[PDB]
Design a protein around this ligand. Structure first.
Ligand code: HEC
Ligand code: HEC
Ligand code: HEC
Ligand code: HEC
Ligand code: HEC
Ligand code: HEC
Ligand code: HEC
Ligand code: HEC
Ligand code: HEC
Ligand code: HEC
Ligand code: HEC
Ligand code: HEC
Ligand SMILES: [Ca+2]
Ligand SMILES: [Ca+2]
Ligand SMILES: [Ca+2]
Ligand SMILES: [Ca+2]
Lengths: 265, 608, 649
């Protein structure tokens, strides 16, 4: 058999220097149905149902993913079927392209430019004062997310927000003797994972952050007016200047010191 | 005719217009009738810096712009307006933006004060010196967000009666007025109120000042009263803690400002360490009481039985706390309305008071025994007689070894506490006992100055806490009177151990001691009444060693030097420092109250 | 060549001045002059043997490498390398010696004082330090596929992290900024067995993490006179060596009408590091912890096509962490108690379970509507609130058909409520009765987002969207009260079919937060207003020169303004000063395909960066009870170039 002939009518371009133009393994062309698998010649085009005219791009059909799904449901394409992308009528083809050697999306220098085309918010966020080093492509969204959708809420590659942070910040994984409750519970109770005006990607910083949760009588619950005109400069005190509350409570992510309950040492 | 007693102020509109203050107000008297024709008044304007605006940890602080005095008959820099219906208004001459020292700030809470002078109305009616103030937002004239109303005049008046007595010729009677003028920039460094007042009371022994609540307590006129524990600063703490130099790091770690104090000195810590010693004291005093009985015998002796009581008043086996008794001290005399046993032997009866300690250092003393769990001791024979001398009486003081809130077995090094004293009466005839009057001096008046835990004569003696345990009379409203009648078992007409030299008789002792104290300025501070009829059962009193004076004269010369009475005293059937028989023959021949008609409110009154 | 070694390799070198080390982030490395070595080569021709190696920017940060080998469809063995490095500063000053070490010491001639303004040898002693963190991950993996169904996975990577962090060690209010060393080595391990079928597959994955800190405590001499407690030196407990292990079973049943997904997960995280006793004068109840936390997860998802007009989905998730570390009595140091205040450790347990249901009804091709309800319930330990429950309902509506316009808008409204709020006994000083920690408080979060793209002419397109969110904590009277986030964005692209492409963007965002607090530990007396805002614009031009000496070049411009402004109002209103970062980036590139088998490219970028934190614009002795690192501001213009070459081999 074989049908070695669909090729010669077509302009000898779509070089198959890539993985799906390879031949050795029992998947794609050899020991398989060749340009049939992705297009479909029971009786080839120039002849809608049971016919050989598979479009495959940003253009004509939609929900065509069916075809590559017969072939690719590994551990990572699970939850794709209700995925924010699938339900957005996004297609495997709008991201990936097969008909050229090595796919651009899997260069990590570029996986951003593709994702930021729709997710315009992130293109602001990684220009902010602090953020993960995506601008110059030391990292990209694949490090945190899986674009095919995960069972976790914002399609994170790990089963919860904190164990996706721990893949790189293991220093901060438990269990510590005296842990700060918010840190253990959810890391983005304080941090914005894409970027922030404030340093260390904090939603709010220095004293007011702590004063959102700490209301005990005394120095934790006073008004720190800062620059005032009447005498109080902003960098002349340990509460608003320097590292604010962390000049005395530096272990904000928890302590394993016998006397660390107040996050002091 | 009815000269105005009280001026009561209501503010209707108070604001700052382009930097010039304006007040419009209503004045009414003690029966809520308008007061019309006011002649002289001083107007003052001020500004409040909030907590922290000067620096983290610093307190709120007034800025005093200045004062203007308006006299309707003479000069007045501003515009004073009488609506001749009780309503008034004043507009200042000063413009706050033009102040050399203070930048007027439209956003700071503002305050305006009024001293209404004692100038009488045009129609001749008397006006009492008065003071009022108002707190307002500069533009809207509404109630401000914040304040500094920490202490209240009521608390000072517990001891001072009227704050005007204290300073500046009576001009100022409300503590908020002082608090506003005595701020940084207006007075010298060290005279700011948060330091001045502490400093003028730190070195006083008054028991009530041992706790911050004599001045810092919850009170409707003080929404900020709690700052006393929440605003620790070098100036205010150092006002009592003068040995520390925070900037130098002497006696304390270095503190170059007040940013950090509150971090270490939280409210609860400041509070307990300054209220705890008083609380412990009350906690230990509360655990034991005493009831005593005293029974006259046919051989002129007296059996005294002392019963120690639990927290609820039920008697206990005394051996259970014998090991905790440092000293149970008794004093027995005869004739409560006029003791006839001296401290030493009396010229008349020839008898000295019966002084016996029932327990010293955990041990029963000679002649004391335990019966039904009670202490018993029988006196030597006493000079029982008729009438008042039918009654013997005994004063009882208890001093227990303690630790914190605990009573502990007494050791050589052991702290002590004076407990509730007891007073006991008994007769030879078996008839009802005579008792001295309590209706002229209530011990409650003392508590104001000396606390409810005045351990009188702690030190050389067991100490005496005067409570209703000694009470035997009630007042108009039906409440128990605690009198100081027990004291006369020692402070006899014949003096104490110097027999006249220190003027020991109780009719004189408190007067001499307290006439020399500038806080004491009116007899109303101890006296709700004078019981002049009491002199009718008095004899002569020892006024120097071995020599005696008729009682009315003796009482008056506690303060009044005998020589300084222009009209002379022997003229009046008085005898001043004569011998015993001569003086007590003349005891009832004194003519003073034919002329002198004294009240606690004015004791200099006379009728000729 | 299709058979045999084939591909391309390249090199590069670049230069940068000046020496302010923030420039090192835009550049490849920190060094004055860069080094680069790109590659992409491939081998085949041995009965399906294939053997590729690829290398991105190796010799500098962001560097990567991947070599593979084996038989195309039976097995593959790879080895990898990655390098990340972020540079923070080289302007900080510390009097401590032994920086980068376990032990920070002052000169033996040092004179303590009660404050930094009065330490005679502080200025004289200050030596410069560089804050920065570098990661080196080297990995290795085997991958064996089977004939029919079963394939296996096994991989192992080791990261070595080095550099310095900012830390604070002091005694009560005396504080010193210290260079916390970081020499971490964290291992990761993966192993998996998958059985795949026509319309189903099961996986069994093991994941393992192992953190090893070289140093376990940080020792430092006190610059200050000894204060109450009488200490000359501190000892901070560093992040302890820990480890975590987990296995997840997953199952997928595919089918044209329905699909079912499931995930089962069990793990344990452990920590047994010995406890710090230096500079600690009380008896520890144990010389070492045996802290263990047990993780369990359960994930269920069904998606079915009830008709072709609409698709119905449901989900369920459950993630429970139970810390059953062992409680004991720990003597805390206290300024009020000389003998220490005793405190019990509180091992926090966290459970989460969510249930959700959705519907995707396509009224019409080009017009899809979606609606869903999500329920979440979180249970917690030792805290103000036991349980918190949120009910959120949402919808999204997309419309592509009409003209060249393509639109969609989505809105969600969620209400969080919970059990009785009542402050914990486990704090050292009880909080205000009115405080509501925002992660626990009743909230109403409503957000709406709309986006439109229109392309009337071909060779141009314009997209713009707008977002608005509001977290409103209705019953919070002390604490976080409200946080609203609004964003705009507009991007455009076009060409007169000129074969040069252009684009331009502007994005704007403001997050406005608003909180209250109470000085007299009662009802509020002050309020805080924080405004966290960003403006970023840029435009680029790119020209591919076709049918000639295959040149291609481009020019890119971007400007950002990150800015924070916070204000506190108690009686009056104060504010914190300048908090901003303003940066211009221009990138000019051009490549010439000279010599056919080779190609050369030239990059040139300018970075004008200026940042200021008004709180840290002070000197070292700037606050009396703290020893600082100094001014951190940056204002520098960086001029960077690089050459690159690639030869076909
Ligand atoms: C000539 C006799 C052809 C044979 C044999 C095959 N194809 Fe083709 N095809 C042909 C032409 C002239 C074109 C261009 C169509 C146009 O509009 O210009 C195409 C197009 C395709 C496409 C792209 C469809 C599109 O996007 O317009 C595909 C995917 C395609 N052809 C696939 C295909 C397959 C799989 C064949 C063998 C099984 C095959 N073609 C044969 C002409 C001819
Ligand atoms: C972006 C919107 C994507 C769409 C849609 C799809 N894929 Fe994707 N894929 C994408 C990225 C960014 C990567 C990088 C690898 C990573 O770490 O995430 C991948 C990877 C793949 C792979 C390789 C193995 C893997 O990563 O799991 C495969 C086999 C793959 N993608 C297939 C695939 C299918 C079948 C898709 C649609 C149903 C699909 N991809 C969509 C980005 C995106
Ligand atoms: C507030 C209650 C926080 C929670 C929850 C988390 N972090 Fe955090 N983080 C917080 C602050 C106030 C800072 C500033 C530190 C400084 O020196 O100014 C940080 C910083 C980080 C950092 C940078 C420095 C650090 O100590 O490593 C990282 C890498 C970081 N945070 C990570 C992190 C993770 C992994 C958390 C949960 C898993 C997390 N943070 C929670 C405050 C808070
Ligand atoms: C202005 C409107 C005043 C008010 C009302 C009160 N005081 Fe005053 N006092 C005032 C001044 C300018 C001074 C002089 C001190 C200085 O150097 O500026 C004083 C002084 C006193 C003092 C003694 C001060 C000393 O130098 O040791 C005392 C004890 C005092 N004042 C008390 C006091 C009281 C009790 C007040 C109202 C009940 C009061 N002052 C009001 C100005 C003003
Ligand atoms: C009357 C003799 C007092 C004694 C006893 C105590 N305090 Fe006092 N305090 C007193 C006054 C008249 C004032 C100033 C009020 C004003 O309106 O300016 C104060 C003030 C304080 C403060 C300052 C609070 C603040 O500035 O916001 C503190 C911290 C304070 N006082 C403490 C304090 C303590 C602990 C006391 C007993 C140990 C104490 N004071 C007694 C008057 C008197
Ligand atoms: C003997 C057992 C006494 C009893 C009971 C009470 N007092 Fe006394 N008091 C006593 C002596 C021996 C002296 C010293 C000599 C003298 O007469 O002054 C005192 C002194 C005082 C004083 C003077 C001030 C002083 O030196 O501390 C006062 C104000 C005083 N006594 C009061 C007092 C009161 C109120 C008592 C019962 C309520 C009381 N005394 C009982 C001996 C004895
Ligand atoms: C305590 C601080 C005193 C004040 C001030 C003044 N007096 Fe007093 N007085 C005091 C005591 C303890 C007693 C003795 C009570 C007893 O049981 O013996 C007295 C007594 C008198 C009396 C005798 C009348 C009586 O009620 O027993 C007189 C006439 C008297 N005091 C006058 C007086 C005057 C005029 C005072 C102020 C000018 C005054 N006392 C102040 C205690 C105190
Ligand atoms: C030194 C200059 C400090 C700074 C700045 C801050 N805190 Fe603090 N804090 C400090 C000390 C000495 C203590 C008590 C030490 C002891 O042994 O008691 C504390 C304590 C706390 C606490 C617990 C006590 C309490 O008030 O509940 C909390 C919750 C706390 N500190 C919080 C806190 C906040 C929120 C800060 C900035 C907003 C802050 N601290 C700064 C010393 C210092
Ligand atoms: C699996 C994936 C395949 C296979 C095995 C073939 N095609 Fe072909 N096709 C596929 C995709 C994903 C796309 C769109 C995205 C992309 O191009 O990468 C296409 C589209 C085409 C086209 C359009 C023009 C173009 O490629 O630019 C043509 C002409 C085409 N497909 C033809 C073709 C031939 C002749 C094939 C076997 C020799 C063949 N395809 C296989 C997906 C896949
Ligand atoms: C959100 C919720 C926060 C925020 C933003 C911060 N903390 Fe805390 N913190 C939080 C909880 C739930 C707890 C446990 C005690 C409690 O239930 O209130 C803590 C604990 C602390 C402690 C221990 C104090 C004690 O035991 O009494 C400290 C010293 C502390 N947190 C400091 C701190 C700092 C400095 C913060 C901002 C930089 C901060 N917290 C924020 C919850 C939250
Ligand atoms: C008025 C008198 C004050 C002032 C305004 C403050 N103190 Fe403070 N204090 C005072 C006394 C008479 C005593 C002795 C109490 C006793 O031991 O019975 C104290 C004691 C302290 C202590 C105890 C330390 C010691 O000496 O053993 C401390 C820490 C203390 N006082 C602190 C303190 C602070 C922080 C103050 C300002 C808010 C403060 N005092 C004011 C008397 C007075
Ligand atoms: C950190 C610890 C500080 C903070 C920053 C301040 N103090 Fe203050 N203080 C502290 C201790 C541990 C002690 C000793 C208590 C005791 O011995 O029981 C004190 C003592 C005082 C005193 C008492 C004076 C005496 O010893 O007789 C005062 C008046 C005092 N402290 C006040 C104070 C002030 C005004 C502060 C900053 C403006 C301040 N302290 C800061 C602990 C610490
Ligand atoms: Ca009785
Ligand atoms: Ca005498
Ligand atoms: Ca280690
Ligand atoms: Ca548990």
């Amino acid at each position: 058999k074989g049908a070695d002939s669909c090729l010669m009518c077509h302009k000898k371009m779509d070089l198959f220097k890539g993985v799906h133009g390879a031949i050795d393994s029992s998947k794609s062309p050899m020991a398989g149905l060749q340009c049939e698998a992705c297009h479909g010649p029971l009786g080839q085009h120039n002849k809608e149902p049971m016919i050989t005219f598979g479009k495959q791009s940003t253009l004509s059909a939609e929900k065509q993913n069916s075809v590559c799904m017969s072939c690719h449901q590994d551990d990572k394409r699970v939850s794709w079927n209700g995925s924010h992308h699938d339900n957005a009528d996004v297609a495997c083809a709008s991201c990936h392209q097969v008909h050229v050697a090595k796919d651009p999306v899997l260069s990590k220098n570029t996986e951003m430019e593709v994702c930021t085309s729709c997710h315009t918010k992130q293109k602001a966020d990684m220009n902010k004062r602090s953020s993960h080093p995506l601008k110059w492509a030391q990292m990209t969204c694949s490090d945190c997310h899986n674009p095919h959708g995960s069972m976790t809420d914002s399609d994170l590659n790990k089963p919860s927000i904190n164990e996706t942070c721990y893949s790189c910040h293991a220093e901060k994984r438990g269990p510590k003797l005296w842990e700060h409750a918010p840190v253990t519970e959810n890391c983005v109770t304080c941090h914005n994972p894409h970027g922030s005006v404030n340093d260390a990607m904090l939603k709010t910083r220095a004293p007011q952050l702590c004063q959102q949760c700490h209301a005990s009588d005394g120095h934790a619950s006073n008004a720190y007016l800062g620059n005032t005109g009447l005498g109080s400069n902003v960098g002349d005190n340990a509460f608003t200047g320097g590292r604010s509350c962390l000049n005395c409570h530096s272990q904000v992510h928890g302590s394993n010191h016998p006397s660390g309950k107040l996050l002091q040492r | 005719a009815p000269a105005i007693q009280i001026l009561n102020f209501t503010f209707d509109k108070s604001v700052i217009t382009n930097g010039v203050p304006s007040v419009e107000f209503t004045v009414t008297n003690e029966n809520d009738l308008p007061v019309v024709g006011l002649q002289k008044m001083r107007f003052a304007a001020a500004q409040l810096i909030p907590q922290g605006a000067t620096g983290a940890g610093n307190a709120s602080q007034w800025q005093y712009f200045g004062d203007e005095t308006c006299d309707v008959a003479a000069t007045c820099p501003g515009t004073f307006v009488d609506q001749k219906n009780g309503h008034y208004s004043y507009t200042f001459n000063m413009n706050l933006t033009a102040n050399a020292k203070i930048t007027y700030n439209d956003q700071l809470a503002q305050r305006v004060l009024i001293r209404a002078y004692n100038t009488p109305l045009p129609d001749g009616t008397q006006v009492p010196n008065s003071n009022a103030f108002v707190d307002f937002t500069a533009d809207t004239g509404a109630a401000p967000t914040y304040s500094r109303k920490i202490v209240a005049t009521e608390s000072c008046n517990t001891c001072h009666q009227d704050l005007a007595n204290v300073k500046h010729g009576g001009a100022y009677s409300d503590v908020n007025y002082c608090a506003t003028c005595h701020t940084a920039g207006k007075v010298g460094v060290g005279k700011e109120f948060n330091v001045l007042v502490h400093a003028k009371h730190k070195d006083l022994t008054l028991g009530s000042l041992e706790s911050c609540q004599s001045c810092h307590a919850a009170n409707d006129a003080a929404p900020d009263w709690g700052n006393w524990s929440r605003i620790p600063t070098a100036a205010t703490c150092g006002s009592c803690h003068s040995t520390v130099d925070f900037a130098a790091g002497k006696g304390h770690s270095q503190q170059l400002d007040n940013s950090n104090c509150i971090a270490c000195h939280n409210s609860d810590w400041t509070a307990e360490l300054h209220t705890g010693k008083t609380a412990d004291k009350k906690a230990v005093i509360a655990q034991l009481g005493m009831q005593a009985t005293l029974v006259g015998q046919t051989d002129d002796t007296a059996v005294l039985t002392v019963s120690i009581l639990d927290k609820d008043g039920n008697a206990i086996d005394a051996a259970t706390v014998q090991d905790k008794i440092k000293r149970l001290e008794t004093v027995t005399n005869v004739g409560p309305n006029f003791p006839i046993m001296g401290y030493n032997k009396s010229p008349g009866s020839g008898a000295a008071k019966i002084a016996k300690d029932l327990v010293k250092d955990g041990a029963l003393q000679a002649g004391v025994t335990l019966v039904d769990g009670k202490l018993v001791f029988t006196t030597p024979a006493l000079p029982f007689g008729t009438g008042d001398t039918d009654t013997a009486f005994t004063f009882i003081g208890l001093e227990m070894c303690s630790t914190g809130t605990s009573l502990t077995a007494c050791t050589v090094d052991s702290a002590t506490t004076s407990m509730k004293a007891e007073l006991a009466f008994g007769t030879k005839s078996g008839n009802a006992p005579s008792m001295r009057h309590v209706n002229s001096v209530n011990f409650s008046t003392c508590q104001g100055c000396h606390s409810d835990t005045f351990e009188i004569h702690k030190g050389h003696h067991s100490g005496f806490v005067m409570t209703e345990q000694v009470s035997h009379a009630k007042d108009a409203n039906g409440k128990a009177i605690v009198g100081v009648d027990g004291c006369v078992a020692c402070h006899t007409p014949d003096g104490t151990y110097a027999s006249g030299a220190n003027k020991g008789a109780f009719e004189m002792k408190l007067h001499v001691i307290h006439g020399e104290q500038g806080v004491i300025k009116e007899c109303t501070q101890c006296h709700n009444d004078f019981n002049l009829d009491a002199f009718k059962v008095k004899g002569a009193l020892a006024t120097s060693a071995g020599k005696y004076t008729t009682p009315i004269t003796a009482t008056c010369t506690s303060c009044h030097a005998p020589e300084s009475i222009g009209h002379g005293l022997e003229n009046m059937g008085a005898i001043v420092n004569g011998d015993y028989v001569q003086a007590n023959q003349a005891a009832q021949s004194e003519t003073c109250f034919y002329c002198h008609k004294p009240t606690p409110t004015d004791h200099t009154q006379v009728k000729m | 060549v299709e058979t045999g070694t084939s591909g391309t390799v390249g090199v590069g070198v670049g230069y940068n001045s000046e020496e302010d080390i923030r420039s090192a982030n835009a550049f490849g490395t920190s060094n004055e002059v860069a080094g680069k070595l790109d590659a992409d080569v491939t081998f085949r021709g041995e009965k399906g043997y294939r053997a590729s190696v690829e290398a991105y920017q190796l010799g500098m940060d962001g560097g990567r490498l991947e070599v593979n080998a084996g038989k195309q469809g039976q097995y593959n063995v790879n080895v990898n390398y990655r390098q990340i490095a972020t540079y923070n500063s080289n302007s900080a000053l510390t009097p401590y010696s032994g920086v980068g070490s376990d032990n920070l010491t002052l000169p033996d001639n040092w004179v303590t004082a009660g404050s930094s303004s009065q330490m005679p040898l502080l200025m004289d002693s200050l030596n410069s330090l560089e804050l920065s963190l570098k990661r080196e991950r080297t990995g290795l993996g085997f991958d064996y596929q089977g004939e029919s169904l079963w394939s296996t996975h096994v991989s192992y990577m080791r990261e070595e992290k080095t550099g310095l962090k900012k830390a604070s060690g002091g005694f009560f209010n005396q504080s010193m900024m210290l260079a916390e060393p970081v020499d971490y080595t964290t291992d990761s391990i993966e192993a998996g067995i998958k059985l795949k079928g026509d319309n189903w597959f099961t996986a069994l994955n093991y994941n393992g993490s192992i953190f090893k800190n070289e140093y376990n405590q940080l020792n430092f001499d006190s610059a200050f006179n000894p204060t109450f407690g009488a200490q000359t030196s501190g000892s901070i407990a560093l992040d302890p060596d820990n480890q975590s292990h987990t296995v997840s079973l997953m199952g997928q049943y595919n089918d044209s009408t329905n699909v079912l997904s499931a995930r089962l997960l069990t793990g344990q995280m452990s920590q047994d590091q010995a406890l710090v006793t230096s500079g600690y004068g009380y008896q520890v109840p144990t010389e070492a912890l045996d802290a263990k936390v047990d993780l369990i997860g359960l994930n269920l998802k069904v998606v079915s096509k009830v008709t072709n007009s609409l698709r119905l989905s449901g989900s369920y998730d459950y993630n429970d962490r139970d810390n059953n570390t062992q409680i004991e009595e720990w003597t805390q140091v206290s300024i009020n108690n000389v003998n220490g205040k005793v405190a019990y450790n509180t091992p926090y347990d966290n459970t989460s379970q969510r249930f959700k249901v959705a519907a995707d009804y396509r009224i019409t091709r080009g017009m899809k509507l979606d609606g869903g309800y999500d329920f979440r319930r979180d249970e917690r330990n030792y805290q103000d609130r036991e349980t918190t429950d949120e009910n959120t309902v949402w919808a999204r509506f997309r419309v592509n058909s009409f003209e060249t316009w393509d639109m969609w808008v989505k809105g969600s409204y969620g209400q969080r409520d919970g059990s009785e709020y009542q402050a914990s006994e486990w704090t050292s000083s009880e909080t205000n009765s009115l405080l509501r920690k925002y992660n626990l408080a009743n909230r109403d979060r409503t957000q709406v987002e709309a986006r439109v793209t229109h392309s009337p002419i071909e060779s141009l397109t314009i997209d713009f969207g707008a977002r608005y969110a509001l977290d409103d904590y209705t019953d919070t009277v002390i604490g976080l009260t409200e946080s609203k986030d609004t964003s705009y964005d507009a991007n455009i692209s076009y060409m007169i079919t000129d074969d040069l492409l252009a684009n331009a963007f502007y994005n704007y965002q403001i997050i406005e937060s608003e909180q209250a607090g109470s000085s007299n530990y009662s009802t509020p007396t002050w309020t805080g207003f924080i405004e966290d805002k960003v403006d970023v614009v840029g435009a680029g031009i790119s020209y591919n020169n076709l049918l000639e000496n295959k040149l291609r070049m481009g020019l890119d411009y971007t400007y950002s303004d990150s800015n924070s402004n916070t204000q506190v109002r108690q009686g009056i209103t104060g504010d914190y000063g300048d908090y901003f970062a303003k940066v211009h980036n221009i990138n000019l590139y051009a490549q010439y395909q000279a010599t056919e088998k080779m190609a050369l490219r030239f990059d040139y970028k300018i970075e004008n960066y200026k940042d200021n934190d008004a709180a840290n614009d002070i000197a070292v002795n700037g606050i009396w009870n703290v020893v600082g690192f100094g001014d951190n501001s940056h204002d520098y213009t960086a001029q960077m170039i690089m050459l690159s070459m690639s030869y076909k081999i």
